[PDB]
Design a protein around this ligand. Structure first.
Ligand SMILES: [Mg+2]
Ligand SMILES: [Mg+2]
Lengths: 452, 449, 450, 452
């Protein structure tokens, strides 16, 4: 009876049990601990506590959860804290005290479980007590305290579909492990009685799984192990959390989870391939348009036009704002979105800047264009050089409606315009943009492109 | 040819469209029409042969001599000339404000820091006061004498082939003085403050033609003609003003929309079309099925956006809000492949009788939700009210409109061009095979997937 | 030394009271009983018998114990204030105390009476308020240490044994710092007298870990053997922070209660039979036919509402003299330094509907849609705003100020009582005769030139 | 005898004495009331009280002045109140609570005559008593009370030079007629003696002259005319004033004097004048925050707060976006626009930039802040330097809702903050920003400031 129960624990201790952010789990009431996948999804109780360990379940009810206080040769320890929130609304805001999940930037604001009927002060409820006691450890200035600091695992109630219909109850979503970076006392007004009650407000920093966005659940097996030390649990623990226990609060901005919407391109993958014809072509473009910026602005307008038409959308070229000097906007255009005789106008603000293909564009120069954009307006930045990482990061993060055109796209679109209606001769378009054509500035308001 | 030439001038209409670029040269001929690729200004104001000198148009306020008639004396007209622009450096808070699309222009008088005394000691402002007194109105006989104000702005042009900066102007309609004020301006050169005049002006609607018949000027410069005899080549707007007064101003001002307003008939399918029948069946089906009609709306809007080559990608709905109306979310990839930028598409739907129209506020509920980088789309079985379209165009609301006509048209080719069946399966699809696809996600998350 | 046991008990036992606590207030009650008639004894909580100190009287208005003489200075321990809001719609006085405890803001008026001779304030209350204001704006931490905390109390109607009972009970509303004190001129609707008085903006500080205070703070402040710097050991963290930093602490120490900003139709409308209700009736019955005169009135009302804060508001124009459209009127709010400030274009919409009717989210959205970047909106109505409209304004974060029946009626009451001497019909006539003249056809952006 | 006198008074009553805003008047206490021109300038005493009237002088001593109560048949009334503002330091102000003139916007911030050694509440002094008795009528509840209201005529001591020789004393200038828009309690501290004292602060609304940029002094003659009733004294009053008498509070935001002037300031104008105490303060600021970025961000948060408080808006302290590194947004606040009952939250984005006081902020740097602004949001840029002219014109043209705080504004605001809270001790403030910039940093989204 001992050899078997031990060999099973060793068996589950050998195999890794990974979870990932977004993983739909099946949280069933009275579920076993053997079924690896219940009802199509990975079973919760098995993932958190396999049957091989011989350990009881880690309940995940609405609010704050925690298993028994782990007593050990190390010290008294809290294994972990399991958090669960809802999304179904039935109110006015619905809540001024609603839990906010910013997983893309690794930050979650979560509110305590103090009820208006709770007789006492935060936190007489088990949940808030666990939260305070853990907060004291997360605010630890030593490794001896941060080792004891129980990991807060996040879960989110999700609606899961199958073949037909949608199941709202019975499923959860792993959101990650987090550090308690701030705790506050708040006052929430219960609308049922119109009476104010106190509560807790946690600012949490979600740590990123290295190298892939996930967590090995054997770490929890380590935490729950009453025969282990606090330092003996950092074997299957993510490197970020380890770096937190090793460093402190100063490691937070470096280990905090970070997810962008779209991909970011380096200067090398924005510029054409080294040695290719497009490289020498871009160099000749930088050499030719170094003296005159305006012809480069006209070129940029035409290029932008061909780029917007490349997708399929109907584009209408407007004009060029300036004839001398510099400004925030260099050229104006318009995009008719939809079908013919029903399409809606979208003003296209354009900025062009000729620069070394090795050089990159600063985010403030892009922002000088973004700032002029009103509702229903989009932008386009045309350059010979590349775009800095922070530029694209700020664009993606803040959801900036700006089309980026670096060396590569410029070279390709121009090369397509050299073959289409230029007849191979590039100096034809190059010189045509220099004289005659460059005199047309129109000099009108940007929103007046709609009228024509 | 003495009076016969002047009578020959009174036969040929000299219509001057609002926006016509004119050639203004120092010592320009009054006989030659076209000058340097442009219509000569001096000939336009004074054709020569009328026995009348050319109406000068120097910087700011101009006016010809007083006109002596058979009864009473009248001022012919007032010729204004401005000059934009400062090449990306608008400097004056006392700059003239031109809103021709709504027939409104605010113009500032020509008092100068050097000018001693109060406005208008200066000739221009003096003329402005004198005219404004008549523009006040009260009686129709008093409005009858009020001199029209013709507006011009110096526009940099292109002489046949290459650009020319100075020596060219641009017509800007005829205006009524609706407000006179005294303002104080600080001269940047000196730093000291000087008084001046500020004028709110209503540019009247031309009527059949946006421009005006310049023979009106000739009639007003005609000494033999009386005041009430000068209103024959004048726009009906000005006549309505002389009749009524300051009350007729809202209904006579120039009104220009960037686009055209469609009627209910053209927003609906042809009266005898099969698509009209399918539309009627659509309405009869989704009368009490809002959610299904909204999923359908998501699909239809998706196919409409797709029917252009534009890289469109669908998403979800939003029936979670909290007693809030349902809206579908989509996303468009803007520009070429790789060189692309996401755009969130927020759409709403309303199944109404094909005869019924959508109010401006209902569309505005979609417009309001739009953050920068978003576009809206409204889908309905009925039509769209005039005022809604007006507000969308005028205020430049980025919202795509799909009436019953476009709806039925796109739906008709959305089934028997891919389904391999009929409309019934789709009507059942939006109910059963669609179900709940709203989720609890913000519209911004569609660009993150 | 024998009573020093009870005194030590008092000094050692934390005596907490929370914002919203119901206290039994009886003048003849003793300071030894902790409970009286079902509720906590006010006089015990404020001045326990173990201290042997006199009672802290809570007369209606402004109260303060005799000056406390310390080894260093002579300080006023505290200033107890008892307001009496009483009514759901309000009383008859246009200048009544209003509470925004969910945001730690209280508009409170001085005790200057119509029958008061001289300048504000020859009355003891206003005098105490000014003497307190001398310290609440202390130029040093030492001065701020002497500053008497304002303890707000507020008469209420508790639900006891005999099917609820009015009077005899007060409500603790927190400890306050005087943000602002200005000269105001009020008018008694009944007597007809116009008199000066003091208008005070008060900041109810955040309690921190608890939503209230420890009255041992008051015990320390009343202790004549303690220096002012020795009395902060039981004071709120927000208060200590204020004493240290001064005015720089106020924006971050106000009490905040996370509560639904959505209001019902009953809250937005006056009481069933209040003065504001009759005012609203006169307004609706008057402006039922003509919408433009009401647009003018709404312009004035929006102006007053924005000017309450002390903001730099400048009127613009009225859009249309006939017909209907998206925006009814235009104004502006200069924000920043007097030398270099940025203007905020204000877009207004007026709609006179049945006071029982509500404004739809689409009707609000017609206004919100017109808002450019840097622009703010305002919607004025005789009716209310639907729940969903407010929900969408909160959700999608619409920069729009909502002025419904109650706010309109109250504001109009103040305007009438302070400019036309209680003559509503004069104001109405002025709106009818002057609306046509206050109309321009300018773009909203042109308001910056004003 | 009687013929000449009565004809003199009649000829004064039938002749408009127009005085414009900015006019320089010769003021001699021993001058006569006959000469209309004294020492190359207009005689003050003649202008304010012509000899033909036979009325006593309207003395203009330093501070607040008022003639004897006019015993009219309607009742007793005050003719007017003549304010004289002592200084123009041209930037060399040492007292933070000096009177501020903004005549281009018809606003004047004025301060009472309460002295540090004054015993009693404001105002036991004659001046403050005059201002309070006046304010009683300026906020008159009826048209008649407003008819009784004595107009405030503002005068500022000026240095004149008509021959090429500057004369510091002896001459004053007209600054229009004003309405007491606001009268509030305030506490000042004389930096000299170091003594703090209470006083009155006033927001004055200089009214629009209408057709003329000034007033006709026959209005004053009529108010001083004891034979005239109060209602009969408006015959030569400005239209704005009559409109105020009729309407009341509702007229004020529409009758303020307005002067159209360029909002663009030079680098010299955005900086405190050289040789001033304020310039020394700015020097100390730049020198102290030359290496500190985030401390300067905290300080900038505080300063922004104070400026918004000056505007009258209710500001709410939010947080700092980061404790380390750089970014677009440094600090976040909130403004509850409207009244207590009816209001809306306005998110405030802030950016700090401790550059050289001679260095100017580029359009791209400002636009990096503007680009982050949604609707219902406002921005604010705080710098030790100035803003480039191009940045300013880009702000004005596209109407960017951003508050500009350059070196001068910053320094002045800091001087007032220090004098009013730390007893003139700047080190306390600086150390406060250095020691508290770490615990003010949160990783929340700017929209979360509505919950604070
Ligand atoms: Mg309206
Ligand atoms: Mg910074």
């Amino acid at each position: 009876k001992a050899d078997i129960a031990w060999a099973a624990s060793a068996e589950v201790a050998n195999k890794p049990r990974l979870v990932f952010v977004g993983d739909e789990l099946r949280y069933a009431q009275g579920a076993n601990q053997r079924d690896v996948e219940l009802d199509g999804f990975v079973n919760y109780h098995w993932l958190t506590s396999p049957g091989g360990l011989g350990l009881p379940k880690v309940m995940l009810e609405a609010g704050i959860n925690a298993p028994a206080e782990v007593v050990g040769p190390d010290r008294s320890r809290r294994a972990l804290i399991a958090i669960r929130s809802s999304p179904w609304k039935a109110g006015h805001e619905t809540n001024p005290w609603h839990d906010e999940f910013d997983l893309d930037h690794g930050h979650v604001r979560y509110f305590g479980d103090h009820k208006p009927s709770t007789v006492g002060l935060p936190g007489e409820t088990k949940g808030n007590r666990l939260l305070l006691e853990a907060a004291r450890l997360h605010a630890g200035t030593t490794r001896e305290e941060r080792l004891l600091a129980p990991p807060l695992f996040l879960f989110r109630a999700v609606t899961v579909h199958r073949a037909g219909r949608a199941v709202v109850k019975g499923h959860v979503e792993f959101c990650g492990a987090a550090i308690i970076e701030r705790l506050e006392h708040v006052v929430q007004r219960d609308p049922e009685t119109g009476r104010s009650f106190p509560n807790l407000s946690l600012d949490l920093a979600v740590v990123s799984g290295g190298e892939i966005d996930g967590v090995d659940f054997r770490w929890i097996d380590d935490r729950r192990n009453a025969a282990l030390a606090a330092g003996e649990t950092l074997r299957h623990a993510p490197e970020s959390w380890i770096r937190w226990v090793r460093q402190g609060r100063l490691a937070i901005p470096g280990i905090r989870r970070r997810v962008l919407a779209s991909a970011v391109q380096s200067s090398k993958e924005q510029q054409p391939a080294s040695g290719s014809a497009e490289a020498a072509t871009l160099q000749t473009l930088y050499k030719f348009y170094d003296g005159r910026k305006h012809a480069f602005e006209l070129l940029a307008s035409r290029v932008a036009a061909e780029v917007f038409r490349e997708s399929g959308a109907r584009y209408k070229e407007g004009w060029l704002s300036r004839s001398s000097g510099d400004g925030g906007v260099d050229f104006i255009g318009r995009i008719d979105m939809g079908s013919l005789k029903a399409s809606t106008p979208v003003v296209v603000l354009g900025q062009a800047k000729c620069i070394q293909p090795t050089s990159s564009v600063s985010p403030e120069q892009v922002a000088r264009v973004v700032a002029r954009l009103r509702r229903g307006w989009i932008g386009v930045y045309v350059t010979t050089g590349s775009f800095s990482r922070q530029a694209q990061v700020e664009i993606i993060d803040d959801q900036y409606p700006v089309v980026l055109i670096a060396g590569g796209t410029l070279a390709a679109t121009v090369r397509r315009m050299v073959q289409a209606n230029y007849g191979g001769d590039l100096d034809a378009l190059l010189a045509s943009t220099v004289d005659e054509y460059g005199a047309a500035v129109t000099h009108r308001r940007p929103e007046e492109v709609i009228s024509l």
